[PDB]
Amino acid sequence: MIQGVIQKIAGPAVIAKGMLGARMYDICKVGEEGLVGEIIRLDGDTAFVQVYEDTSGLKVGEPVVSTGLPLAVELGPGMLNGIYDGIQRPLERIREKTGIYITRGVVVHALDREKKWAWTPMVKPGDEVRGGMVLGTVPEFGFTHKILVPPDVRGRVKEVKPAGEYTVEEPVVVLEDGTELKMYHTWPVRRARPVQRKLDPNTPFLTGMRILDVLFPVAMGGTAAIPGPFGSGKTVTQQSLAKWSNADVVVYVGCGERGNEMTDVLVEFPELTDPKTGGPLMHRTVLIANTSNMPVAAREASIYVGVTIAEYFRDQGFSVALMADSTSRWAEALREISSRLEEMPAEEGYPPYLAARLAAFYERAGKVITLGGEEGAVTIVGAVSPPGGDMSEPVTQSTLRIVGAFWRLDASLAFRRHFPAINWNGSYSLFTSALDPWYRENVAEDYPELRDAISELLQREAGLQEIVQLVGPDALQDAERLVIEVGRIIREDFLQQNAYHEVDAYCSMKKAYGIMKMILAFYKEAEAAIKRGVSIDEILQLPVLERIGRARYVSEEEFPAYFEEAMKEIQGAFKAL
Amino acid sequence: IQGVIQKIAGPAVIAKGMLGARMYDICKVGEEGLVGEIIRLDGDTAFVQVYEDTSGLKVGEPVVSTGLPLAVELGPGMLNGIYDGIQRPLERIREKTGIYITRGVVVHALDREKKWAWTPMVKPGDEVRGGMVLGTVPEFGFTHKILVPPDVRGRVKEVKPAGEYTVEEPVVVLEDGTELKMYHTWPVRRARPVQRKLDPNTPFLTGMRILDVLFPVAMGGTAAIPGPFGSGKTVTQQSLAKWSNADVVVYVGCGERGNEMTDVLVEFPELTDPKTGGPLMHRTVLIANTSNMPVAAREASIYVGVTIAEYFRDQGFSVALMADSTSRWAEALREISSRLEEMPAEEGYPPYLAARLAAFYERAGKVITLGGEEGAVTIVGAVS
Amino acid sequence: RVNALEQVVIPGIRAQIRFIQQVLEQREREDTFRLKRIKGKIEAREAEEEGG
Amino acid sequence: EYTGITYISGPLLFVENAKDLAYGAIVDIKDGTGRVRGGQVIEVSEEYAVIQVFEETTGLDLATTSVSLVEDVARLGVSKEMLGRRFNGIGKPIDGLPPITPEKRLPITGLPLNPVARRKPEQFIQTGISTIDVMNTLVRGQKLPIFSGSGLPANEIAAQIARQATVRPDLSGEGEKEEPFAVVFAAMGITQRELSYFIQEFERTGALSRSVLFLNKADDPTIERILTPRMALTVAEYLAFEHDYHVLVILTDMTNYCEALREIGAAREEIPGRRGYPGYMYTDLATIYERAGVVEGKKGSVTQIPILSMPDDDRTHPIPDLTGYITEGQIQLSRELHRKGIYPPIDPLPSLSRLMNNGVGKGKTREDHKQVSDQLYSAYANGVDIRKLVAIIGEDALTENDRRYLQFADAFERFFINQGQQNRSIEESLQIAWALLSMLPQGELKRISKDHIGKYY
Amino acid sequence: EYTGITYISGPLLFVENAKDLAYGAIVDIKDGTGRVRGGQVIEVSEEYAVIQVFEETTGLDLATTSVSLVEDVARLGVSKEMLGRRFNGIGKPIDGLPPITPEKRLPITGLPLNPVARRKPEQFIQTGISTIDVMNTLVRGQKLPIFSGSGLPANEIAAQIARQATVRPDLSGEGEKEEPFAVVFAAMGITQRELSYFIQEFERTGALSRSVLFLNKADDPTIERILTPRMALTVAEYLAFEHDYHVLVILTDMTNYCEALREIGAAREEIPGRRGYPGYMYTDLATIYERAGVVEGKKGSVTQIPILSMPDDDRTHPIPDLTGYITEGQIQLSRELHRKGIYPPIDPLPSLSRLMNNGVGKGKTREDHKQVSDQLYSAYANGVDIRKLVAIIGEDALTENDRRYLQFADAFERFFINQGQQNRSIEESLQIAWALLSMLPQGELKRISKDHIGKYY
Amino acid sequence: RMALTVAEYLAFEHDYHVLVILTDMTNYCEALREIGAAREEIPGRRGYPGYMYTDLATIYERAGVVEGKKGSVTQIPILSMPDDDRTHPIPDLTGYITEGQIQLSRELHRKGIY
Numbered sequence A: 001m002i003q004g005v006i007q008k009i010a011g012p013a014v015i016a017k018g019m020l021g022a023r024m025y026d027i028c029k030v031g032e033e034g035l036v037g038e039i040i041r042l043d044g045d046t047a048f049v050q051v052y053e054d055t056s057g058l059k060v061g062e063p064v065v066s067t068g069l070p071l072a073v074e075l076g077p078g079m080l081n082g083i084y085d086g087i088q089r090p091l092e093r094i095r096e097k098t099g100i101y102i103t104r105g106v107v108v109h110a111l112d113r114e115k116k117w118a119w120t121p122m123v124k125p126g127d128e129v130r131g132g133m134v135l136g137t138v139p140e141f142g143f144t145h146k147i148l149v150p151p152d153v154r155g156r157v158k159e160v161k162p163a164g165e166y167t168v169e170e171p172v173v174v175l176e177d178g179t180e181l182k183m184y185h186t187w188p189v190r191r192a193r194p195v196q197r198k199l200d201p202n203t204p205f206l207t208g209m210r211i212l213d214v215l216f217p218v219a220m221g222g223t224a225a226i227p228g229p230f231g232s233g234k235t236v237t238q239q240s241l242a243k244w245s246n247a248d249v250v251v252y253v254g255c256g257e258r259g260n261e262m263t264d265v266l267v268e269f270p271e272l273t274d275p276k277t278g279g280p281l282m283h284r285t286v287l288i289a290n291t292s293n294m295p296v297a298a299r300e301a302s303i304y305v306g307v308t309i310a311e312y313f314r315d316q317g318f319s320v321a322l323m324a325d326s327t328s329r330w331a332e333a334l335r336e337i338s339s340r341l342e343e344m345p346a347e348e349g350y351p352p353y354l355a356a357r358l359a360a361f362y363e364r365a366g367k368v369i370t371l372g373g374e375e376g377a378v379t380i381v382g383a384v385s386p387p388g389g390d391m392s393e394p395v396t397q398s399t400l401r402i403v404g405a406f407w408r409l410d411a412s413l414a415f416r417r418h419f420p421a422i423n424w425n426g427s428y429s430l431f432t433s434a435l436d437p438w439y440r441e442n443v444a445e446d447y448p449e450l451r452d453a454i455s456e457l458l459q460r461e462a463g464l465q466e467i468v469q470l471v472g473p474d475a476l477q478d479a480e481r482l483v484i485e486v487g488r489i490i491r492e493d494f495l496q497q498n499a500y501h502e503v504d505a506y507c508s509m510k511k512a513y514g515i516m517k518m519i520l521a522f523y524k525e526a527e528a529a530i531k532r533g534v535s536i537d538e539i540l541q542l543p544v545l546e547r548i549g550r551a552r553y554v555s556e557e558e559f560p561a562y563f564e565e566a567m568k569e570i571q572g573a574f575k576a577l
Numbered sequence B: 001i002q003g004v005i006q007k008i009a010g011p012a013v014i015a016k017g018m019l020g021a022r023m024y025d026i027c028k029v030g031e032e033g034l035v036g037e038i039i040r041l042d043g044d045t046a047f048v049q050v051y052e053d054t055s056g057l058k059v060g061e062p063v064v065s066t067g068l069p070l071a072v073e074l075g076p077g078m079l080n081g082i083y084d085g086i087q088r089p090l091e092r093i094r095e096k097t098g099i100y101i102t103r104g105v106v107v108h109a110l111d112r113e114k115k116w117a118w119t120p121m122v123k124p125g126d127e128v129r130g131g132m133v134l135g136t137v138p139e140f141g142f143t144h145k146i147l148v149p150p151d152v153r154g155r156v157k158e159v160k161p162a163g164e165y166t167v168e169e170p171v172v173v174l175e176d177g178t179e180l181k182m183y184h185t186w187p188v189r190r191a192r193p194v195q196r197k198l199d200p201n202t203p204f205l206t207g208m209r210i211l212d213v214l215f216p217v218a219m220g221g222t223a224a225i226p227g228p229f230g231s232g233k234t235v236t237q238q239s240l241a242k243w244s245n246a247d248v249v250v251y252v253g254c255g256e257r258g259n260e261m262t263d264v265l266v267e268f269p270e271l272t273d274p275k276t277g278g279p280l281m282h283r284t285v286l287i288a289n290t291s292n293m294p295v296a297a298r299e300a301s302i303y304v305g306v307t308i309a310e311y312f313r314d315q316g317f318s319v320a321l322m323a324d325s326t327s328r329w330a331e332a333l334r335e336i337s338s339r340l341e342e343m344p345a346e347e348g349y350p351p352y353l354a355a356r357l358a359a360f361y362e363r364a365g366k367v368i369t370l371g372g373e374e375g376a377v378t379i380v381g382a383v384s
Numbered sequence C: 001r002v003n004a005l006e007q008v009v010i011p012g013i014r015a016q017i018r019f020i021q022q023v024l025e026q027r028e029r030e031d032t033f034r035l036k037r038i039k040g041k042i043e044a045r046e047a048e049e050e051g052g
Numbered sequence D, E: 001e002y003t004g005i006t007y008i009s010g011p012l013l014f015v016e017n018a019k020d021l022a023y024g025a026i027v028d029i030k031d032g033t034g035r036v037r038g039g040q041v042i043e044v045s046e047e048y049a050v051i052q053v054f055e056e057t058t059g060l061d062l063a064t065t066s067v068s069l070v071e072d073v074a075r076l077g078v079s080k081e082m083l084g085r086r087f088n089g090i091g092k093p094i095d096g097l098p099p100i101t102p103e104k105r106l107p108i109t110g111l112p113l114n115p116v117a118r119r120k121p122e123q124f125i126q127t128g129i130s131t132i133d134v135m136n137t138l139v140r141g142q143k144l145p146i147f148s149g150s151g152l153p154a155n156e157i158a159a160q161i162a163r164q165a166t167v168r169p170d171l172s173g174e175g176e177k178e179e180p181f182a183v184v185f186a187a188m189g190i191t192q193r194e195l196s197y198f199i200q201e202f203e204r205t206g207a208l209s210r211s212v213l214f215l216n217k218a219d220d221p222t223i224e225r226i227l228t229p230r231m232a233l234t235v236a237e238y239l240a241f242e243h244d245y246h247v248l249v250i251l252t253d254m255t256n257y258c259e260a261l262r263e264i265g266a267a268r269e270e271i272p273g274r275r276g277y278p279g280y281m282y283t284d285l286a287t288i289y290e291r292a293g294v295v296e297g298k299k300g301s302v303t304q305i306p307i308l309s310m311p312d313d314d315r316t317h318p319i320p321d322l323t324g325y326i327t328e329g330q331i332q333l334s335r336e337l338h339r340k341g342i343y344p345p346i347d348p349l350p351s352l353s354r355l356m357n358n359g360v361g362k363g364k365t366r367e368d369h370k371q372v373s374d375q376l377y378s379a380y381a382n383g384v385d386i387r388k389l390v391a392i393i394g395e396d397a398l399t400e401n402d403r404r405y406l407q408f409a410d411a412f413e414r415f416f417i418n419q420g421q422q423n424r425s426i427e428e429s430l431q432i433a434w435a436l437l438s439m440l441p442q443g444e445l446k447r448i449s450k451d452h453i454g455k456y457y
Numbered sequence F: 001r002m003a004l005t006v007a008e009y010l011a012f013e014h015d016y017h018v019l020v021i022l023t024d025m026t027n028y029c030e031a032l033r034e035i036g037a038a039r040e041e042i043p044g045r046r047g048y049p050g051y052m053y054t055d056l057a058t059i060y061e062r063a064g065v066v067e068g069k070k071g072s073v074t075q076i077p078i079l080s081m082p083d084d085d086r087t088h089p090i091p092d093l094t095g096y097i098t099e100g101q102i103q104l105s106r107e108l109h110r111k112g113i114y
Helices: A091-097 A303-316 A328-341 A394-399 A436-443 A447-460 A462-468 A480-493 A509-532 A536-540 A559-575 B090-097 B209-214 B234-243 B260-267 B297-315 B326-338 B353-362 C002-046 D155-163 D193-199 D224-232 D257-267 D318-326 D370-384 D386-393 D400-417 D426-439 D450-455 E154-164 E192-204 E222-243 E254-265 E281-289 E318-326 E335-340 E375-383 E400-417 E426-438 F002-012 F026-035 F052-059 F089-097
Strands: A005-010 A013-017 A028-030 A037-039 A048-051 A064-066 A073-075 A116-119 A134-140 A143-148 A157-160 A164-167 A171-175 A180-182 A185-187 A195-198 A223-225 A249-254 A319-325 A368-370 A375-382 B002-009 B012-016 B025-029 B034-042 B045-049 B062-069 B071-074 B115-120 B135-138 B143-146 B163-166 B184-187 B194-196 B222-225 B249-252 B284-286 B319-323 B377-382 D005-009 D012-016 D026-030 D040-044 D048-052 D068-071 D075-078 D086-088 D104-107 D181-187 D211-215 D246-252 D301-307 E025-030 E039-042 E050-053 E066-069 E181-186 E188-190 E211-213 E246-251 E293-295 E298-305 F018-021 F073-076
Touching: A028 A037, A028 A048, A037 A064, A048 A328, A073 A303, A116 A134, A134 A171, A143 A303, A195 E192, A249 A303, A303 A319, A303 A368, A303 A375, A394 E254, A436 A447, A447 A462, A447 A480, A447 A509, A447 E335, A462 A480, A462 D386, A480 A509, A480 A536, A509 A536, A509 A559, B071 B297, B234 B249, B234 B260, B234 B319, B234 B377, B249 B297, B297 B319, B297 B326, B297 B353, B297 B377, B326 B353, B326 E281, B353 B377, B353 F026, D026 D040, D155 D193, D155 D246, D155 D301, D181 D193, D181 D224, D211 D224, D224 D246, D224 D257, D370 D386, D370 D400, D370 D426, D386 D400, D400 D426, E025 E050, E039 E222, E154 E181, E154 E192, E181 E222, E188 E192, E188 E222, E188 E254, E192 E211, E222 E246, E222 E254, E222 E281, E222 E298, E254 E281, E254 E318, E281 E318, E335 E400, E375 E400, E375 E426, E400 E426, F002 F018, F002 F073, F026 F052, F026 F089, F052 F089
Parallel strands: A223 A375, A249 A319, A319 A375, B222 B377, B249 B284, B249 B319, B319 B377, D086 D211, D181 D211, D181 D246, D246 D301, E181 E211, E181 E246, E246 E298, F018 F073
Antiparallel strands: A005 A013, A005 D040, A013 A048, A028 A064, A037 A048, A073 A185, A116 A164, A134 A143, A157 A171, A171 A180, A195 A368, A368 A375, B002 B012, B002 B062, B012 B045, B025 B034, B025 B062, B034 B045, B071 B184, B115 B135, B115 B163, B135 B143, D005 D012, D012 D048, D026 D068, D040 D048, D075 D104, E025 E039, E025 E066, E039 E050, E293 E298
């Protein structure tokens, strides 16, 4: 057995002594109320215990008995609909059995066994089973939440219970291998669910904004990231995957989401109804986020227990949208480790483990077909911040800018009316040569052509921008204000979108397609306006610029007929004048 | 002395069984005898700075040490003689190891397996003056005066006739005892005594008008050429030494480029002197280090050359030293001082940088020796 | 522009990098000093197994 | 009384014969100055412990030292009736009369509030500054730091929010005037003028019989600059939640906080990791700010207003760093409008806002400033920015169009942002606002709707 | 056994009886989860070693710890049949075929080539590109970095030109059938897309039947990252020097390699250098670019090309500083080209080879190549400055000469820089050049000889 | 400090006035800095000793006029600037210490003035 007591309790961490048989990165039970530690170092019979819950009364000579599980995540149903911790404890059970205050040493079931779930078997008792094979279909709302065989386990069946409710603990398929397949099954958080092969991303993910796709495209099965210095719109950009994503499985998880930000965002989901589902938004949101009211060391666990949950979903055969809300918070939590263990991290205030545990998080799942023949795609978006306000640091380069998309925010940029805001130049996408197939065939064979063509104009204005701030234009010409005004309209209506309004943005092909064709029209004719002898001053004073300036309020349903009537007005109020 | 390895961290080795160890002592770590050096002792163990990288070395081996402090080697064969920053001959490395270099290489530092000419310029029963007259070697450069090192003014016995004698073979011995051979050892970290340091007053030719006639530094200057090489600047460096009034040229780099630095070496015998009328190679010492060369090779680079020029000075020759890549010299030093308690404290460089920087110029210039002869050590500081 | 450039602008846009630089650099004295004392602890700990 | 020192220097002591001490425990001690001080067992060890004294050592001999475990956990007596009374960081009342009897003795470490137990608030208040109550909308259970530079006032502006803090009677569709409104204070480092300046504006407020003051001075120990914050907030928890009153908490001098934070930062074992400040800083600014929030089942609330005083106008400085991220919706002060004589000198051009169409601007919060907020932004911008662009392009060069931009700058700022002793209700704001907006013809006023325009014509 | 554990901080492990074990060894460690893990044996004492687990950091325990000493010295078997193999990382089966065959044993850490036996370049490689064969001239056995940005994709422009390259040395008189070509790619930190995007293209046209691949996955630890270049470096040796092949090393993203290093050193008691990046770098970076070049008497040679990423491409970063001394000349990718969509992004203006005369000569690349290279330099450069004067003053108010120098630049990006994946020869690239230069009068041709003007217009 | 103390003897007592013509304090800082880099006084302020003023205190102390005895001792520091900027401690700290300053700039050097 593993036994021992507290030697030196210092900070949220406990340093034990007398530890015999203790193994690295394994769950424990710590104190006398159960706070749960992790062996994060050995030095013989002393092992630095890291205790995810903060200490507050615990003292010398108290128990330290390690369980002997490899911080296993308990996989099963009941994930959908219901808040959970980053350390996986349902918050429902806490609020009802304590009070409204979070107290240290609250220990409840990680995966509830105060629930039962209707079983439909499918597998027959005469067959054999295979790792990654469906045993039946548990009906959780409108979704199909299959039950699979844990990888690295197979046998031959001999019995299969008939339909009825059963507790997740009870078996529902038994085998000749000495085992019983239950809907309660261990899989480590340090070991990935096995994949059949890796697939090349080649379908893009629709993140339903006309600037987070159209200009800088993001991939399905991809990875992407957005930063945000000092609260510039770090939290707000997940109101753009709130429901304007095409995922069938949405996992909102936060490394640390402060108290005020779960007063609006976390309560937002039971107050909404997703239109793709047709049913509620919380049906399709897992919820496994962590608060900053929740201890500092719970912030460090967060990432590895929700990534595996993302894999569990990916396996079933559903699009998974995982997005780690402010991944920057796991870094401070990781960095606190050094202080407490007598070590000093990576220089210039950088975390002690850089690439190692960042590259790992991102590549754990992502564009992979499974053992079981289903299509796994994981779209992961890091919503980091630079702690010191520099976008030039190791951890941004290794895995936050070498991904599918890199984006940026300025501080007076977003304040005008762009919510969220992006830098037109300084922001690129690496993946864009692999997102060209679907966009060609499905949308149009000039959707990849027009989207590079809009980006050209947007970044060419930059040419003149500089000289404006050097000594200015003291000469306005016909070819001058051409690029300049156009580009203006483009930044005014196409990058000022709001995520608080469903009329200023929404997930829809045709809105993106449409708006971008209106602008094409205004542009097209303007070049042939000047030649004839039409002053750019009058170009402003056509009402049609205002028609394109009232496409960002238009009702979604109305847009088709609206667009068709408006394309004609451009071409009429240009060629006439 | 002889001791036993205890630790190996990095390229550096630390080994106990040292006691009565000298400072800047000859160390040949292991049974592989990697060219190393004893430094800063600690306890009954020492810290050992091993130039050549270690990766085959196991702990607990025997460590042979000479018990005598590392010195610069000074004898014949240096004029028209290829060597590196450890001062081994890079071409007898090519013949005894092949194209590739496999560490733990030790060969003699001068060509000692040749039979070199001799003529006695002194006799028995006369007394010698330090820094001057012993005997000359006729060579096919000019001449090379093999002179006795400073503070050795005693009586001589047994001076043998003009012929051919190996470097290790004796031609002379002292009447008062203490034997001497043609090879001489002079300390790496000390400079030879002078009588006055003069003032510069003979202009330093560079063979191109504008260079010296407009802006002279004369003989015993200190100059500089900034900006990185590859701008055709290398034109200047070769032709400089090539035309310039001297009788010996010493070329030295450290952290210099790849293939561009090997173009220089083959094109060096294809440079031609105006005075002799034949190659510059006849009368050129190389101690260049490339950049594949060992850790502290480049760091020891400087000091070698300085010394070596002072030899030619004492003889009554004019030397022309060309300090290529002074900026890249610092690279190695930073690395070494990090792994010790000489940690950065200035501005991205250790503060002992300025100390090691000065002495290179301080201990060069146009001055008169104990032997009474003149010569100059003009330095041109390519910082780059 | 010429006049202006050679005074306020150009060396000013210089001194900004310089000021920045130096303070980034000097910050890293505390790094090394702390890291020093860290080292001291580590060795001090393995020196209680073999002595006091 | 355990004797045997090993290290004494500052408010961190180490003393042996210990292992009976727990994390977060009240001890007492003896000193050579003939006085009995305090000590929180912040860290615990094998045969010693780390103690944190509630006073500076200025004398402590090694013949006479003591330790006496008073209590296992660490606490403060807190009762219902303590309103009308003043206090200090030690926790003694400074009134002059016997200390009140507790109902609960609650820990001073703080118990966090469930994110599940809150829900979106929507009842707004009059701050008596127009600019806030339009752009950010200061509602209960929300933070809104007022960023303040060094060489800038901090005291002046703060006072304005304290005497003009008042719920809407039904301007939002309801009141909370039906339940007592009260205020809590706690200063973390104050001089000779800031002491009295605050007290004399609380007699303006008329509140000194219904407020709890936890004044910490600079003549008071430096260790109580980080104790007092937590401490104060537990007396917030007690009176908002469990005795149903809407309590305004106002925290100032969160730079004097940070002085004391730094001390423990490097003098303890732990190493710096936030560009020369600690790395357990996060927790120190989490435990503080995250307590506050309107809880769903309670009528009452803790509305926290942080007031910074941060070194200069750097934004890489530790303080504005973490604070930014934490709070939802922010307000800034600068030196653009403090050279003009405009008190307060709020500037929202660099400032940011994240709640203004997020359960606010909609709901039981009026929609009649909904589109106004969105409009004011890009309109105020057109202003400020081109004031810079003019001095490059020309020296007076502005085109037909841009002329209008800059025309709306000087005007808006003067009228609107000078409030101070002038209160404006929800209605009074919007009227005036629209009349400066008539300076721009239709086409820049695209964001305001057809209704809005006429609404407030 | 080797029992005794002290510190498992991260991916450390200590073991007793470290005296048999040596520095620069690699070893099997036995743990109770059944895992087989390499790990180089570093920082050896006579009581304590440091070993660094090649598999995760989870499963280490203090009950089962043993070490099988493999061989004290660095080892790695080399084969000559590596010319159609495929491997990822260290050298593990992705071709399904055996990893190694021992025909010789060479370490991954030795001491590079004598400079006395280093020859200079005299042949050339054709990548099928324009600008990296005309304006800058890469030749057979050459050191030449490709400076990319992190905003920019390193990785695409890497593998593109990879498969695309087919040697051509017709004009010199050496065939493609007296020159074999071996493409060695060694990457690190590649994502799920990038890892599959490579193998596919390589397999597309034959570039994996005449090449051997390496690419170190992002699921792998940072200890294997490092050995990756040193690995493929040592293989490149046994082909080109000892069977007469002309290999091409393409390293991809050097930054990731240097990051990794930093963590190994920090646990090997050393202090990182400037900007917080390794200071012990100089040596390690040297041996990778200096264990390539030509050889005297062997026609083969390893040509070295590294690719690195830079946050803004500045020189303030250590990452270019170091490199830029040991390598000759420079290629650098700028933002302006790439944004607009030009592939390759290579701008010839920051670029300049330091060796273009010490590579090929006259008649080996046609005689006109020399001066036609310093024509196109000055013709282009002039025009990128009057693009920001194309509408201030215009081009109608500008001289005749300068008007042509505009259009010239535009057609240069379209036809010359860009060609995507199309191949090109020395002769077809000089063809483009002539046509573009016919537009300029003979009066504006002054950067070529009279011979060259009368050679073609 | 030798030059200094030595002179105080001959200065006051024998009554002869002397002016100590001290040259580059650059090389002073430079050399000083090495020592504190192995005893861990950690020099740095901008990369120059932060204990600088401390040592310069006694050294430049005698530079005014005494009472009683005639003849005196007067310091004349002479040192370059690495940059015009008075940010780096080479001219900055030296500034504060001493009594006023006199720069020669480069504003007239540039013209041929001497």
